[PDB]
Amino acid sequence: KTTTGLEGFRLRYQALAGLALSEVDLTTPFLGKTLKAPFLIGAMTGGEENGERINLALAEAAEALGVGMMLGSGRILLERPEALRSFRVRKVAPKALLIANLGLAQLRRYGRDDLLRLVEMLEADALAFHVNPLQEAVQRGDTDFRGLVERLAELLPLPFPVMVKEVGHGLSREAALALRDLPLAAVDVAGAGGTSWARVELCEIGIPTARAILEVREVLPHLPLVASGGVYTGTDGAKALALGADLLAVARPLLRPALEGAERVAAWIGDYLEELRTALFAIGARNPKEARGRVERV
Amino acid sequence: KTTTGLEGFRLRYQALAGLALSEVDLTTPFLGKTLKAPFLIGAMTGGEENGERINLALAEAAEALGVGMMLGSGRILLERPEALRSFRVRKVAPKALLIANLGLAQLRRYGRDDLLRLVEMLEADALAFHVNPLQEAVQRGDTDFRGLVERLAELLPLPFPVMVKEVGHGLSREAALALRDLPLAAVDVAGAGGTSWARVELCEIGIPTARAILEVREVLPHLPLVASGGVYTGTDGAKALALGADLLAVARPLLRPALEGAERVAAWIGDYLEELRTALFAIGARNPKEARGRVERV
Amino acid sequence: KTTTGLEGFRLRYQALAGLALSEVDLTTPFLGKTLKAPFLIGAMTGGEENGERINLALAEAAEALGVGMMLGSGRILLERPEALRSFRVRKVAPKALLIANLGLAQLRRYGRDDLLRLVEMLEADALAFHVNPLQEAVQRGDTDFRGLVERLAELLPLPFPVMVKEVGHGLSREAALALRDLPLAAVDVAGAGGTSWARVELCEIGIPTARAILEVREVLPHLPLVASGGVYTGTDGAKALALGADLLAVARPLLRPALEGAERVAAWIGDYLEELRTALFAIGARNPKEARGRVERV
Amino acid sequence: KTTTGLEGFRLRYQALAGLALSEVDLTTPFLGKTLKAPFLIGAMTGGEENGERINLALAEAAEALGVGMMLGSGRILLERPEALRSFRVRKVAPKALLIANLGLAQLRRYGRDDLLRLVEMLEADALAFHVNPLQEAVQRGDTDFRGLVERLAELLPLPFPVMVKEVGHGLSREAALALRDLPLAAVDVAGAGGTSWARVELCEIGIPTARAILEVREVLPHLPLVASGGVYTGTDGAKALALGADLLAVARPLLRPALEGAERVAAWIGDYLEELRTALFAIGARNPKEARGRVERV
Ligand SMILES: Cc1cc2nc3c(=O)[nH]c(=O)nc-3n(C[C@H](O)[C@H](O)[C@H](O)COP(=O)(O)O)c2cc1C
Ligand SMILES: Cc1cc2nc3c(=O)[nH]c(=O)nc-3n(C[C@H](O)[C@H](O)[C@H](O)COP(=O)(O)O)c2cc1C
Ligand SMILES: Cc1cc2nc3c(=O)[nH]c(=O)nc-3n(C[C@H](O)[C@H](O)[C@H](O)COP(=O)(O)O)c2cc1C
Ligand SMILES: Cc1cc2nc3c(=O)[nH]c(=O)nc-3n(C[C@H](O)[C@H](O)[C@H](O)COP(=O)(O)O)c2cc1C
User: Fold this and answer.
1) Is the sign of the CA dihedral D65, D68, D73, D77 positive or negative?
2) What total number of domains does chain A contain?
3) What is B162-203 written as a DSSP string?
4) Beta strands A295-297 and A9-11: pairing type?
């Protein structure tokens, strides 16, 4: 019932922009490594049956496409060092940009050494902390979110790039304010409009992705932003970039192809990127950064 | 065809608000007694068959949940002192906050002693006068509403707290103006959007609850306000509170569970409050009062 | 596909207005006689079979309700003095306010004496000229509308009150401008939203009644205005009055009851007026004139 | 899913404008010849089977109605001088205004002499260059659009009038900017809302005709503009003219009648023009130029 808000925007088509489709470059460095496109495979947990199966389809595809990939919560990896193989993905993705995952609420039960061990076990290149009071609140799970930001601030200068994200309910402007002084490497807005890790009566609460991207960019103008949350088409990707994002992330829609092998995942991402490439071209932008502003309301 | 208007508002979700769900306190003193939640069971008459049956289900639940309860018009109690047992509810609700009810149009046929007798017979803690020109007008009932406010003003300083309410068609800003100098204890906006005591072609007339809450708060900034009229979910409750209300009231939806015993009523209110609690938490509010303003348009 | 626009307005319900339904007076003098309500039976031609039958049902009802009545084009009466009995209605409506009708385009084929003869034959109290370039244009009929206003200006000071009206496509503000210096007795806005005498691909052209009432009132603030064109309910009547009208007129919906006798017509008008009376009461207005402004957008 | 935007506008009906339908003159000179109406038959290619068949139905009709006609891309005529008869239409349309067609992207493979030969072979009166990066991009065709405008600027002073057009995706204001200094004879906005030569997931990109007409007129106030792209009714034609256009063009809808002979095409255009004539009349405009501004929003 709640959309991303991107349908309330129009890409500014430029018939006489004078570009050559081949001129558009999607190359975009992120978190230390250089990506072939401003795309990330969203974080996903799912089941322990298909777990390892899915991660390897995504990772392999990611490696082929030169795209980044966020792993699901390594939470269990701390307590169950045996579910290590379920995530170990470097075997099929040796050079890809991998981002470890963990709930920010875990900072009260895990210290620096645990964080280092997690990304080291996974051979990850960065760590993303997800914060989801709403989800954990509705699930009567762990609802104490006090001092987490201050707890991260203490730790923050870490040996690898660190980022923060929501899980489909979005980050508001005052949320970006709370992150303003932290030396983060990036932020994933993860707004409402697509799927909610919580859903998978109160699920009307949340911030539309389009809205989140605008609010967060205003507060953190210089930080690299990841637009995710129902940003399912290359066209929507371009809109997100024009509103202020730097990277796009897709999770849910990738489940289907992930169960049918890397070839299918790779194809999905491929349609999305080629579609993104046409949009930037039609927009007069020669790269993701140039898409900024080339969008209007109504 | 006419909504409360609350769908035109968005709760401002705060992922990084830094609260613990357990930190949100719903305790709110009202009309002399202290409630466990800012909730009231709306006034209802219905039939003489189920009459006593329903009141006792509501009252008992109210007592268990620490919530307030408005009784239906005690009109008949004045003329028929035998329908006394139909309302006598203290038997099952000894400490709850009970609010006697009576049409403001009755002030022309009843004096001070009658008002005192009514709340004393009911062992009520306050008296609420409902004013419904539209309803009585459409029902060709008693349509003379002259001098009622002046009549109440004369009486007003009474031995117990007194309030005024509509019945599903709402109170406008100029209505709040007419109540401005009266020493009332509270006001129930009772707007359009849910059910109309009148309905239960002209029923398009009326003021949307969301609209009424805004208008009345502007005129009576310091007075405690009750938002009612299709405020059926905890989410809608939070929106009402953020727009300016202090208490929520639900009537109609409570009929079903009231006919199936207190256990069912209590469960309904329970879902509503726990749902309200999540919303305040998701909003960054630690209590009803803090919800104020944490809502935006569109 | 095009509405009156009145659905985009909300009557301002006044719970504490302090009126008595019996206090609202609909009496409104118009074109020389005093009406019991600000209502007129719209002009209608139809067929020559039911012609006389319908006029007598309307006229009789009009007489009973103290309402005005506009006759259909007396055009044929000029050329065919035998269709005199088809309109002769005084037999059943001796004191009612009757308004003769004639296309403004006829001023080029008829002079003063013809106009006097027409209203005298009909025993009418006034003459209304309808101007419908669109309708006659679509019907490839007589489309020369040059100098008609100047032609009426020359004649205008007539022995009886004269007015101008459209036929369901509305009068714009610049239209009111063209009528500004004429000594007219009243104007019927007759906008789009209900039925079009033309309809009974281009019928999207026209001005919504709500829109016409606003535009014309702005240009002719002091002149009495008749709101017509899909103003089918008492509620819509009140809205029209609050937007600036002084009288309401309904045509089409009256056909059905007119074929079933005066008793049915009279009943229809009766529901409409009693419904109008409730609305003014709910609005805080004690008469049609006081309804002005008691309406808001959205 | 994307409309022209013309539905968001209302023609300003003028009941008292004082015109005679016969007073409205559609005569409008364009590209050197004088048209009986501000109408052009849009450019269409289609198939090689019906090719010649369709062109002759359109051309013949154009000749009868005194309207202009744009031919499909003469691209093939350059390489295949045998498909000359497929376009040769003067046989049935000796005096009509014919406009040769060619993709602007061809300027990199064709020089002045080739352009002269093309219009001379076709016995055309002007040349229209269509620019469609989006279409060619989605069709993985020729996507290099660099230096085309500068290439045309060099050539531009040609022996005949030259114009530029899109193909159903529209020209933006910055597009008009890129054409600002070129000595063009006219511009065809060809916006989104009707059909896209490309369509015949990314086809949401583009500029609504209504929007394009406004943007382009603002940048090129003095240049004659052609509104096309789902401008299928005379009413829509009038709206386009009131927004700023000078000529209307319809392509797709003309296919059906073109396959059933000139008589059918001629009839279609005939309904459209007579419908356009009524609209200007209803609007108070005595010709296409006077329609300007006689339209409002909402
Ligand atoms: C099955 C499923 C599992 C998920 N697991 C995680 C997880 O472990 N960690 C995390 O930070 N987000 C997780 N998410 C959230 C996504 O990374 C992110 O919120 C995203 O915005 C939702 O997918 P998207 O909008 O394409 O649909 C999960 C989402 C889904 C649907
Ligand atoms: C069956 C029924 C009986 C009611 N009886 C009373 C009554 O005696 N006194 C009163 O002040 N309001 C009465 N109301 C009005 C409600 O207290 C109040 O207007 C409310 O806003 C309508 O319920 P709510 O919006 O949840 O649905 C009654 C409403 C219903 C549906
Ligand atoms: C069958 C029919 C006949 C009409 N005849 C006349 C007529 O003779 N003269 C006139 O001025 N208007 C005539 N009208 C127009 C109405 O008086 C007026 O335009 C009105 O706004 C249309 O009815 P209303 O909106 O309730 O539906 C006629 C309308 C209808 C439907
Ligand atoms: C079958 C078809 C063939 C077309 N061929 C050409 C062409 O050769 N050259 C051109 O410039 N435009 C061509 N167009 C585009 C139209 O001239 C123009 O874009 C128009 O706006 C689309 O038709 P309209 O909106 O009525 O529907 C073609 C369109 C269609 C549907």
Assistant:
1) positive
2) 1
3) EEEE-SSS---HHHHHHHTTS--SEEE---BTS--TTT---T
4) antiparallel
Which residue on chain A is closest to D141 by alpha carbon? Answer: A21
Phi/psi for A93 (5° steps) reads: -135, 70
Chain B touched by A179 (CB under 8 Å): yes
- Nearest Cα neighbor of D225 from D147, D170, D273 is D170
Resolution value (Å, 1 decimal): 2.6
How many A from CA of B67 to the centre of ligand 2?
17
| Cα A84 to Cα A66: distance, rounded to the nearest angstrom | 24
Q: Whose CA is nearest to atom 4 of ligand 4?
A: D44
Q: In whole angstroms, give the CA distance from residue D94 to residue D96.
A: 6
Helical segments of chain C, H only: 51-65, 75-79, 84-87, 112-122, 133-138, 148-155, 173-179, 209-219, 234-243, 255-258, 262-283
Cβ–Cβ contact A11 with D under 8 A: yes
**DSSP 8-state code for residue A43:** P
Q: Which domain holds residue B285?
A: 1-298
Contact A93, A69 (CB under 8 A): yes
Nearest ligand 4 atom, CA D130 = 11
- Is residue C238 within 8 A of residue C9, CB to CB? The reply is no
Q: How many CA atoms lie within 13 A of A39 on its CB side?
A: 33
Quote the CA–CA distance of D266 and C140 in Å, as a whole number.
20
Those residues with Cβ within 8 angstroms of residue C65's Cβ, 6 or more apart along the chain or in another chain: C36, C37, C39, C266, C269, C270, C273
Tell me which of C150, C165, C174 to substitute to probe the interface with D (most D C-beta atoms closer than 10 Å).
C174
What distance in Å separates the CA atoms of residue B83 and residue B72, rounded to the nearest whole number? 12
Look up tokens 């205005």; give the residue: C225
Distance from Cα B70 to the centre of ligand 2, integer Å: 10
Q: Which amino acid is at C211?
A: R
Q: Do C202 and D279 touch (CB under 8 A)?
A: yes
Which of D16, D19, D235 lies at the smallest CB-CB distance from C205? D235
Partners of B103 in beta bridges: B130
**Dist CA B114 CA B119 (whole Å):** 9
* 3 state SS of B28: strand
Atom 21 of ligand 4: nearest residue by CA position = D229
In our burial notation (b when 16+ CB lie closer than 10 A, e otherwise), range A157-167 reads ebebbbbbbbb
User: Whole-angstrom Cα distance, residue C117 to residue C127?
Assistant: 11
Q: What is the CATH number of the domain that holds D121?
A: 3.20.20.70
* Alpha carbons B82 and B51: distance in angstroms, whole number: 13
Amino acid letter at A11?
Answer: L
Tell me which ligand sits closest to the C-alpha of residue D105. 4
Per-residue tokens: A117: 């061990």
CA-based radius of gyration for chain C: 18
